[PDB]
Amino acid sequence: KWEFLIGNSIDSSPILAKNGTIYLGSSNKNLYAINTDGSVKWFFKSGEIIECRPSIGKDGTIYFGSDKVYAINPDGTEKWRFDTSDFTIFEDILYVTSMDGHLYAINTDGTEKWRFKTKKAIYATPIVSEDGTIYVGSNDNYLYAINPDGTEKWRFKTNDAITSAASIGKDGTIYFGSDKVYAINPDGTEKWNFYAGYWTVTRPAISEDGTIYVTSLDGHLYAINPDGTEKWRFKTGKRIESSPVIGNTDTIYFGSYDGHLYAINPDGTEKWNFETGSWIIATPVIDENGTIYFGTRNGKFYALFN
Amino acid sequence: KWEFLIPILAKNGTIYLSNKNLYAINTDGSVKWFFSGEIIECRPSIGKDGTIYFGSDKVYAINPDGTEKWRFSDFTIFEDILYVTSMDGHLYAINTDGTEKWRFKTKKAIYATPIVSEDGTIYVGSNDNYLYAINPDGTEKWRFKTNDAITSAASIGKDGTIYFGSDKVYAINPDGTEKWNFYAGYWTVTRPAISEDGTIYVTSLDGHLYAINPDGTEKWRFKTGKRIESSPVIGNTDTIYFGSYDGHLYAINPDGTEKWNFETGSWIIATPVIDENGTIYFGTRNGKFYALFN
Numbered sequence: 001k002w003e004f005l006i007g008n009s010i011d012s013s014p015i016l017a018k019n020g021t022i023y024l025g026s027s028n029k030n031l032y033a034i035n036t037d038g039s040v041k042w043f044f045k046s047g048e049i050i051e052c053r054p055s056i057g058k059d060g061t062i063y064f065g066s067d068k069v070y071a072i073n074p075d076g077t078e079k080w081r082f083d084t085s086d087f088t089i090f091e092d093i094l095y096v097t098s099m100d101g102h103l104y105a106i107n108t109d110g111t112e113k114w115r116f117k118t119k120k121a122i123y124a125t126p127i128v129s130e131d132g133t134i135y136v137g138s139n140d141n142y143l144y145a146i147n148p149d150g151t152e153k154w155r156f157k158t159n160d161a162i163t164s165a166a167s168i169g170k171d172g173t174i175y176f177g178s179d180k181v182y183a184i185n186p187d188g189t190e191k192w193n194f195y196a197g198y199w200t201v202t203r204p205a206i207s208e209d210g211t212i213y214v215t216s217l218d219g220h221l222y223a224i225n226p227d228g229t230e231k232w233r234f235k236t237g238k239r240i241e242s243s244p245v246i247g248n249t250d251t252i253y254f255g256s257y258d259g260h261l262y263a264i265n266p267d268g269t270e271k272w273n274f275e276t277g278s279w280i281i282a283t284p285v286i287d288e289n290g291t292i293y294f295g296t297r298n299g300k301f302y303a304l305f306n
Numbered sequence: 307k308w309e310f311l312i313p314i315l316a317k318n319g320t321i322y323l324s325n326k327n328l329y330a331i332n333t334d335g336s337v338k339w340f341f342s343g344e345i346i347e348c349r350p351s352i353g354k355d356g357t358i359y360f361g362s363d364k365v366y367a368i369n370p371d372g373t374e375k376w377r378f379s380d381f382t383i384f385e386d387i388l389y390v391t392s393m394d395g396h397l398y399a400i401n402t403d404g405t406e407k408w409r410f411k412t413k414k415a416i417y418a419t420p421i422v423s424e425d426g427t428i429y430v431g432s433n434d435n436y437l438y439a440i441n442p443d444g445t446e447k448w449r450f451k452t453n454d455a456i457t458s459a460a461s462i463g464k465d466g467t468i469y470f471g472s473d474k475v476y477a478i479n480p481d482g483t484e485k486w487n488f489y490a491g492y493w494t495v496t497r498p499a500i501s502e503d504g505t506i507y508v509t510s511l512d513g514h515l516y517a518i519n520p521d522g523t524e525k526w527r528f529k530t531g532k533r534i535e536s537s538p539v540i541g542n543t544d545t546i547y548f549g550s551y552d553g554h555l556y557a558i559n560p561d562g563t564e565k566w567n568f569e570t571g572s573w574i575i576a577t578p579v580i581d582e583n584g585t586i587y588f589g590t591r592n593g594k595f596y597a598l599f600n
Contacts, residue, residue: 011593076376076377077373077374077376078373079375079376080372080373080375081372086575098511098533098535098551099457099495099511099535100492100511100533100535110552120454120455120493121455121457121493121495123417123457139433139455160414161414161415161433161455163393163415163417198394199414199415201393201415217392217393217394239392239394241392241393241394257392258310258404259310277310278310279310279311281380297310297311297312298309298310298311298312
């Protein structure tokens with residue numbers, strides 16, 4: 001209303017980064033500010049921020065590093081600051097998938113540019129590469145590469161439904177999971193595949209040095225080399241249902257379903273672990289400051305600083 | 307209780323919230339909202355010609371502020387036991403202390419919400435195309451094979467018939483034998499809504515709202531020309547409501563005739579819900595909410 005007189009602003013939505021990460025967008029605008037001395041100033045009531053004390057290993061050893069972990073329990077009025085997708089917008093075009101099996105390309109006004117049909121329902125989040133190619137998997141077991149004009153560049157057959165978004169390395173290699181982890185070349189040919197102990201339902205995280213990290217329902221964080229060989233695996237006692245996230249210092253973070261948070265060094269050794277006591281199912285997100293957030297089922301969220 | 311973890315999904319298919327933080331009914335009959343310029347009443351239409359609607363039904367558009375959103379799954383709790391599904395393909399029975407009572411493994415990831423019948427039997431579908439009937443002890447009572455992944459919850463009718471959909475809509479007898487199946491012009495991805503009369507309602511990605519008789523025969527269909535990605539909800543007036551993906555809301559009478567329709571202009575994907583007052587809520591993608599009053 002009164003657009004010709006009063007300005008308006010669209011809400012900030014999280015965007016899936018090609019490296020497999022998910023950036024808040026609004027970053028910490030509504031969450032916190034960084035003091036000159038480096039301290040963190042949370043925009044929440046005094047008695048809702050609790051600094052956690054991570055451990056190292058299981059012997060009870062206390063973690064004493066640069067990483068800081070905070071437990072935030074926002075009041076109902078504060079829930080909006082942090083939301084405890086089936087679409088992606090690219091160059092004024094909305095790419096949204098549908099359980100009807102089609103990938104839809106919608107204009108700003110909401111009209112349909114074109115639609116691409118797959119044989120089964122799609123539950124995966126679509127991603128768009130630099131050259132406009134849209135990558136998305138379907139319950140029909142295929143990963144599709146669709147051109148900007150809605151035509152099929154190619155498709156890659158797997159042995160299981162693709163319900164997670166794909167990741168793209170600097171190289172251009174496309175990484176995704178179904179019956180196993182797959183690395184596909186820009187032209188649609190397979191570079192290699194790796195079985196992470198279970199079918200894959202989360203997005204792979206791509207490091208700067210090229211390492212591909214994938215969490216697995218088998219209770220392990222796997223580190224895969226660019227050539228598809230296993231670098232190492234880190235064992236947890238609980239299934240991991242969400243993707244891992246890479247911190248500003250190359251540390252890899254993730255949490256098992258029971259809310260057990262883990263920080264792993266690139267060499268595969270544990271940096272720290274922390275039991276929140278709160279089940280989690282949502283994937284972690286990161287802001288422009290590298291701060292990582294783990295939202296819990298019970299309304300709270302844990303923020304990790306570096 | 308379940309602090310580590312924390313609406314009810316009725317067996318008929320409806321989801322209940324419960325509204326004390328939303329509104330209040332005025333003596334004369336009006337409604338007092340707890341949000342001024344955020345609440346706007348809408349005037350429904352009838353058909354496409356242009357007829358305006360002015361019946362007992364009332365629809366309100368709600369655009370709450372970020373600090374007001376508080377005012378308004380993969381698990382179910384039954385008799386102090388947490389039943390939660392996993393993408394690892396298992397249905398888990400969890401104790402109050404968080405310990406595992408048992409786990410039941412299916413061949414593929416499970417994305418459907420589990421439901422528990424009154425006698426304790428758990429019903430849940432899997433991407434392995436089977437609907438599973440699990441006993442309280444974690445033992446398999448039976449399973450029913452379909453041709454596509456089951457990704458939505460099942461509904462149970464008064465006579466115990468279990469309804470769910472995958473490649474098509476299926477009606478299953480408590481003993482696991484198929485009573486009948488019905489193809490709603492597209493594979494099914496939302497749960498059926500069962501009326502008091504036993505009529506089975508289901509929305510379709512083909513743009514229709516289908517009404518199925520207890521015997522499996524089609525009672526009627528309502529076309530919208532727009533794919534429906536959310537389940538239908540039945541109000542206290544036996545009226546059936548639903549919304550197409552583009553946020554076009556519809557109210558259909560039990561006989562198949564349209565009661566009224568309102569173009570929201572806001573895409574909808576979430577399933578509608580109802581409160582203890584019979585008020586139906588439709589959450590939109592852009593953060594707004596539309597309250598329907600009987």
